[PDB]
Amino acid sequence: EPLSILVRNNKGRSSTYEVRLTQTVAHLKQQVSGLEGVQDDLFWLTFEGKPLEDQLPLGEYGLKPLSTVFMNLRLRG
Amino acid sequence: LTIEVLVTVDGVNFRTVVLNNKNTYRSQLGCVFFNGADISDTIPDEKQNGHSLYLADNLTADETKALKELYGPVDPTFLHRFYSLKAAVHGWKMVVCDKVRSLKLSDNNCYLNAVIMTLDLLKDIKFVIPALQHAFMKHKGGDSTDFIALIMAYGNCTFGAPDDASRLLHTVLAKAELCCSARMVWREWCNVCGIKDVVLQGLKACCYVGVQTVEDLRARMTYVCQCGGERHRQLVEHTTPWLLLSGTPNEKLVTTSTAPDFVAFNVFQGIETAVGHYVHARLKGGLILKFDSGTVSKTSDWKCKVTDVLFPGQKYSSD
Ligand SMILES: [Zn+2]
Ligand SMILES: [Zn+2]
Ligand SMILES: [Zn+2]
Ligand SMILES: [Zn+2]
Ligand SMILES: [Zn+2]
């Protein structure tokens, strides 16, 4: 049932993540926070130019296997 | 020595609670708001009997059901955050600088001044969530307290702390829809898989995080395909009433001598890895109006790290 998507960091390196479309992006964000050394309040994710909201399931965004999600540094101004 | 109050979530459906003068609201019922004020840690008395109070915690199923109809699929924490953020922001003020409305600096709220002033130029959007649209309509009428607090609560912003204006601006727009037509057609292809057209409509065709200029949006992109090869993607049609592009802070020299295409943009001051400052800018009458949280100054040239860039309408077709 789970599938594999890619999250890419500011440096350009993609990593694989096994996820389910019923998981929330808050759950994916904690997997991403685990692989790199960054905490959830320091970044936000985009797919196809649009942000991913924390409390919504991944299936709301049309992710297919090896879809590439981008990590964006959460600025503090 | 007993009072009866009416708790509500929507101001239309009420439910009574009998309370005593011995314990406080929080122990008997939960956190409650009376005329915008938290009274959860006060002991009830006669001046509350008969009046309605807005319950924030410990909601029942039927009040939760009404909560989701008014604010959308929100999380149990939401209502407390919203009510508390609204009372904390009460002191903030919107000040008119050069015939427009801007938000004065208080408690690191400059990222919000960028968000709200960029939204104020989008004059063809509405929100699908009722509470949000009501707050948005009130903000456009004068009182912005509700609208400020709501986008703070929807954006998971902590009070008095700096945040990311592009994050919040695009998060808020994901809750909005467009009152006119808009269309964006991507052409994807892979030498092994084939060619496919992806079509986006409405407000979703007017925002994109990842590029900051219309040339870079229309450029051909290349990424790994599900087969293992390299898939390509390129814009082939675009018609919008405006276009909002956001990226990381990118140093540019914006000048009015070459008459730029964009109508407005946001600037980050400082370095990305530390706490910086946001400034909103519009172009009017051959000058750049800089809006630094309740103050305004004009310049002809500015070296600055831009983030969000708002363009006018897009009429494009290629290939
Ligand atoms: Zn409570
Ligand atoms: Zn409370
Ligand atoms: Zn392929
Ligand atoms: Zn490749
Ligand atoms: Zn290649």
UniProtKB/Swiss-Prot annotation, chain A:
Changing residue 22 to A: Strongly reduces ISG15 signaling and abolishes interaction with ITGAL and activation of SRC family tyrosine kinases. One of its GO terms (biological process) is regulation of type II interferon production. Residues 1-77 form the Ubiquitin-like domain. A motif (LRLRGG) lies at residues 73-77. S-nitrosylation decreases its dimerization, thereby increasing the availability as well as the solubility of monomeric ISG15 for its conjugation to cellular proteins. Induced as an inactive, precursor protein that is cleaved by specific proteases to expose the C-terminal diglycine (LRLRGG) motif. This motif is essential not only for its conjugation to substrates but also for its recognition by the relevant processing proteases. The keyword Repeat applies. The record marks 74 as: Interacts with activating enzyme. One of its GO terms (cellular component) is cytoplasm. It is found in: Cytoplasm; Secreted. GO terms for molecular function: integrin binding; protein tag activity; ubiquitin protein ligase binding. Residues 74-77 are annotated as: Involved in the ligation of specific target proteins. Detected in lymphoid cells, striated and smooth muscle, several epithelia and neurons. Expressed in neutrophils, monocytes and lymphocytes. Enhanced expression seen in pancreatic adenocarcinoma, endometrial cancer, and bladder cancer, as compared to non-cancerous tissue. In bladder cancer, the increase in expression exhibits a striking positive correlation with more advanced stages of the disease. Induction: Strongly induced upon exposure to type I interferons, viruses, LPS, and other stresses, including certain genotoxic stresses. Ubiquitin-like protein which plays a key role in the innate immune response to viral infection either via its conjugation to a target protein (ISGylation) or via its action as a free or unconjugated protein. ISGylation involves a cascade of enzymatic reactions involving E1, E2, and E3 enzymes which catalyze the conjugation of ISG15 to a lysine residue in the target protein. Its target proteins include IFIT1, MX1/MxA, PPM1B, UBE2L6, UBA7, CHMP5, CHMP2A, CHMP4B and CHMP6. It is linked to Immunodeficiency 38, with basal ganglia calcification: A primary immunodeficiency predisposing individuals to severe clinical disease upon infection with weakly virulent mycobacteria, including Mycobacterium bovis Bacille Calmette-Guerin (BCG) vaccines. Patients are also susceptible to Salmonella and Mycobacterium tuberculosis infections. Affected individuals have intracranial calcification. Both the Ubiquitin-like 1 and Ubiquitin-like 2 domains are required for its efficient conjugation to cellular proteins. The two domains play different roles in the ISGylation pathway: Ubiquitin-like 2 domain is necessary for the first two steps allowing the linking of ISG15 to the E1 and E2 enzymes while Ubiquitin-like 1 domain is essential for the final, E3-mediated transfer of ISG15, from the E2 to the Lys of the target protein. Homodimer; disulfide-linked. Interacts with, and is conjugated to its targets by UBE1L (E1 enzyme) and UBE2E2 (E2 enzyme). Interacts with NEDD4. Interacts with PARP12; this interaction inhibits PINK1/Parkin-dependent mitophagy. This is Ubiquitin-like protein ISG15. It comes from Homo sapiens.
